[PDB]
Amino acid sequence: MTDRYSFSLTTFSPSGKLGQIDYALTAVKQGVTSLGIKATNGVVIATEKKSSSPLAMSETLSKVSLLTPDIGAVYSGMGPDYRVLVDKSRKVAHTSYKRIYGEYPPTKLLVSEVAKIMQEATQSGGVRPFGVSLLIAGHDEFNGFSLYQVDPSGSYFPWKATAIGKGSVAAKTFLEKRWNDELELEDAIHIALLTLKESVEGEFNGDTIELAIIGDENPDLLGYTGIPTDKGPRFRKLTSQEINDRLEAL
């Protein structure tokens, strides 16, 4: 019971080049492919669940996660450096904002409250960074949709569309064709899947890969009734079947 590693684990280069994050962003690429696109009607994300054995479930693993009733997120790279991060954000949306202004926050203010710990993983002592760069979706009645990519250094890009991982640049070479402005959502799944078909060698079934979306108000989820005022959970995930119903429909 004694702490003596309180130095920084971080190191300057001669020419900037902070070392042990620049090595980190290999594993983010070594990890799986995953993406995210918006449109005025709604927003989408997706990944590919690489079930190792023929034994493991995919129900137990959340390669997609809920943040609030109006947000989702997704990663590539490492998992255990993702699972922890959710709860340390969920506990923050309340313990700084949500129990203090009532309403849940807009999307970016949350993002100020994940980089503000991701940063502390580096400039502090006795620690490493999370080998993860993840993605957020946006909604609010005062600023609208958005995506926001983050990264272990502490930055956060905004976007209109992007993707990451072992097939990233090819997608970024692709989607700059597919994207445009005149966009609903029901179209966006074709391109999103059609993208994510080319960058795979294994099976391509609905019970293999999970994704989720940003729909509109869905009070059936809300559980209770009577108040016409409330805005239900815009966030939502899909099932096994509804994936395949798209796939047959190609």
């Binding site: 019971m1 004694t2 003596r4 590693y5």
Partner: protein, 243 residues
């Protein structure tokens, strides 16, 4: 090579060789055993003399932790005594609780994770000792040995020091000869045989013996060292087994 320099640095083999060096430190120490009799346990140990100037019978190496226990060790004299001073207060902070004596599985469950804690960190020394303990609870008889990697298993007998190879095969030569049940008094004879039988790795030097047992029968399952002719009865016997 370059991974064998500090605590908590696993190998490609999947180990930390440093504690495996500890095993050679405890290898550089005295003989010591303790036997699971039919109703209790026994303790006996090697205690070598350098000069006549060392007094006999003022320098025990057994330690007691509480009434119903005896414990010994071998190798590093101080380090094997520290955790006793942890032991002597822990169970005391357990009889504090439900007002009953402590089990033996309570002992190792309250020790065998301790020394582990001295192998997690890059700031401490693994307890370079192998260690024994025994005694009685409501349930009956017990016995255990420790090794510096935290491990421990319930034996019928044990051995340490450089009295390993003699006793282990010997107890293999004992048990089949007498599996039916060995009461307390009788093992006090047969135990002190082994130490006279095991000094031959170091018969350049001399010593004198030290014994303790504890019986549910005899001593109300309390701890009680030997001091009397009964010891002298055994040394008169144990010379014959080597005669």
């Amino acid at each position: 090579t370059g991974y064998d320099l500090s605590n908590s640095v696993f190998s490609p083999d999947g180990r930390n060789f440093q504690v495996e060096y500890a095993v050679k430190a405890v290898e550089n120490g005295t003989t010591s055993i303790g036997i699971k009799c039919n109703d209790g346990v026994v303790f006996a140990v090697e205690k070598l003399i350098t000069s006549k100037l060392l007094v006999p019978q003022k320098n025990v190496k057994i330690q007691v932790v509480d009434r119903h226990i005896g414990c010994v060790y071998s190798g590093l004299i101080p380090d094997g005594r520290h955790l006793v001073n942890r032991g002597r207060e822990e169970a005391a902070s357990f009889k504090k609780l439900y007002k009953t004596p402590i089990p033996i599985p309570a002992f190792a469950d309250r020790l065998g994770q301790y020394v582990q804690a001295h192998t997690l960190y890059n700031s401490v020394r693994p307890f370079g000792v192998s260690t024994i303990f025994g005694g009685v609870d409501k349930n009956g008889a017990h016995l255990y040995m420790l090794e510096p990697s935290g491990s421990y298993w319930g034996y019928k007998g044990a051995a340490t020091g450089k009295g390993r190879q003699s006793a282990k095969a010997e107890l293999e030569k004992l048990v089949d000869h007498h599996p039916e049940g060995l009461s307390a008094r009788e093992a006090v004879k047969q135990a002190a045989k082994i130490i006279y039988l095991a000094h031959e790795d170091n018969k350049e030097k001399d010593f004198e013996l030290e014994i303790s047992w504890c019986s549910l029968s005899e001593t109300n399952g309390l701890h009680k060292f030997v001091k009397g002719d009964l010891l002298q009865e055994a040394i008169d016997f144990a010379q014959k087994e080597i005669n």
